[model samples]
Structures are given as C-alpha cells and as structure tokens.
Target: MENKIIYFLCTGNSCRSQMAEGWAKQYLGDEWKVYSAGIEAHGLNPNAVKAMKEVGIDISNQTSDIIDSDILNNADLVVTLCGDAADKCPMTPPHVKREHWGFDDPARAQGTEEEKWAFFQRVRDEIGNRLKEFAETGK
Candidate 1:
C-alpha cells in the first residue's frame, strides 16, 4: 500500500523527533503515514513547537510517545534521530528499514531563550531536509 508508514524515534519524544514527525507530514504527503516516539517520553517541548510554527509547520497538536512495538515493527521506515535511540532501538520486522541520524539534542541548548530556540530551529531544519530527501528519493 502507498500508505506505508515512516516512524521517527529519539531518546525523548520532545523536540527533534516531534519536528521530524511534523516535517514528514508535509514532505511525505498522502502516500505516507507518519509517526514518532521515544525510548522514553519527556512530553513535548515549547521551543520545538515555536521553531516549527516559525516555518509554518504547526506541531503544537502533536503528542509525545513511548515506543510502541506494534507500530515500530509495522513501519516501512524507522528513523532514529538521537544517539541513544540509535544504540538502544528495539528490534523490528526484518523488512523494516532503519536509519540512524544522531542529531543534536535541542532540549539541552543553553543560554538565552532565543539561543535555545535557535538550536531547536537548526535541528528542525536538518530533520526537514532529511525528510524532503527521503520523499524525493525514496532512500
């Protein structure tokens, strides 16, 4: 089915993974079903929501998630966006394609509020680029 699924994962389903999910919806369109989760849920991040809204991608309605084996094993593609998720990712179906990103944790960004959001925006952009490439190339 063109309704094949793409799942994004991280240490905490707070910032980067949330952004990844938001961008996937835009990039992948109706042929895809997008999802995101973490090894552990840390709730959503305000900075992440603001960063995406700035780009006109509304992610405020997205919710944090703990990895669900049911969904993970069923996905056509499963992306690990954090080193922790990369190393500790659960086993999935043999045909489920996996990619490890090891991106920066925007939640740990230090200093001023804007500085923190700058970090969030950077990661969001990076994730967006990757999703765009996947949508275009199928890789």
Candidate 2:
C-alpha cells in the first residue's frame, strides 16, 4: 500500500502545526508522510523548534507555508492543531478525511521559559500519545 499522507493545519503554522508535523514524522516514520501549513503564511516559530528539540525531534528545516487545496487532495487525513485552524481551515473536494485535533496555543500560555516549555511539552506529549496509539492500532 502507498504511504499515508497526513496534513496538519494551524493559523500560523509556526507552533502547533509544526510540532504536529515533527511528531508525525518521528513516530510514524516512512509509513506516513506528514506536512503542515497555516491559513496564512507565518514563519516557523523558534520556540517550536526548541520544544521539539527537547523531545529529540528536529524541525529546523521545515518552513511555514500557506495551505493549498492540492495538499488536501494528497492527504489521507488532515488534523487541525489549533481552534482557529480547525474553525477556519479548508478542505479539498469530498474525499479527504479531516479532524480537529485542537491543541491549546502553547505560545499563548503565560509564565516563565520553563512554563512555556511545559506547555509545549504537554501538547507534544499529547500528540505523541495519540499518534503512537494510532500506529499501534494500524490507523
């Protein structure tokens, strides 16, 4: 069977979506091709790179891109990482499966650098857990 493609969407593509893409690639490996984008083009978040690095995933080479209908056409599933992305994110024609895996904006969380890391880690762990579970179940 062909590898599955999963697209992650967010408002900025800077944080949540980027992290989701990283997690998908790391956990799912070559079994899936992961991509992420924003409704609008926003550079990738530095903090997101830092956060993923904490989990030993590198997304430094990834860039934020604007979502296109063609991505949806190629994706087997699309997961939206933030509320704005889920609420405003688009879809292709009728076949691609889409779901809102909404995560809190780690950038919006208040507190120290450690606290910010904590937020990122929380979402990161959540994403990892969900994806790993899916892999185990053959999703």
Candidate 3:
C-alpha cells in the first residue's frame, strides 16, 4: 500500500498538535508520512515534550512550523486538534480527509505544577489512544 500522508494541525503548534503528531508517528509506523504545523508557529512546548517522553516517545526535535501549502495540498488526512485550527485551517485537496479532535490546551490549565502536569498527561494519553485506534482501523 502507498504510504498515507497525514498532517496534524493546531492554532499554536505548541501543545495539543505536537502531542497528536507524536502519537501518530508512534502508533502508525512507517506506512504513513506524518507532519504537523500550526496556523501560526508558537514554538514547541517543553511540557508537551516532557509528557510524551514519559510515554517513551520523543518529540523534542520536532520544530513548530506554520502550515505549508504544498504539504496541506498533498496530505491524505488533515486533523485539527483544536477549534482555532479547525476554523482557520486552510483548504485541503478534495481527496484529503479532514477531522477535528477538540481538546483543552494544557498550557491554559489553571493550577499548581502537579495539576498542570496532570492535564498534560491526560491530553497526551488521549491523543495516544485516539491515534492507536486510527492505526488499527484507518479511521
């Protein structure tokens, strides 16, 4: 089978989108070419990297980037991990499948260090679970 090209998008490309990108690559393996970007680059979140590292997936080297038209046009799937990205996401080619998986931003969580870490862990696990299912069923 030809490799499916996937793009995970978010408003900031910081937290949620970054996590989803990591999960997709971890779960889907080499059968897919995965990429992630934001409507506006906001740099990778250290907390997000920390959370993924806890799960044995390293995303620290993935740079936050603005969406590239060429990539968006070529993707088989474009997933927006937040409302802002969904709303502002660029048009994809007709064959591209678009999905919105809304989740709270861990960066926006209001609480102590432990509480914020809890939020990051929860979102990270959720993205991991969702991507695992997609890997199993291509959904």
* True-vs-predicted CA distance for residue 110, candidate 1, Å: 3.0
**Candidate 2 to truth, TM:** 0.84
RMSD of each: 2.4, 2.5, 2.5
Q: How well does each candidate superpose onto the true structure, as a TM-score?
A: 0.87, 0.84, 0.88
Give per-residue CA lDDT, model 2, range 1-139, as digits (tens).
5988888887767788888888888778758878888777668777788888888988887888888767778888887766532356544446778877766767766778778778878877787788787667744
Error of 2 at 66 (Å): 1.0
Which sections of candidate 2 miss by over 4 Å? 84-93, 111-114
Residues 4-103 of candidate 1: C-alpha lDDT, one tens digit per residue: 8888887778887889999999988847788889878867898888889988998777789798877788888888876532356534456778888876
Q: Best lDDT goes to which candidate?
A: 3
lDDT of 1 at 24: 90
List the pairs of residues colliding in candidate 2. Answer: none
Candidate 3 segments whose C-alpha is farther than 4 A from its true place: 83-95
Candidate 3 TM-score, true structure as reference: 0.88
Error of 2 at 139 (Å): 6.8
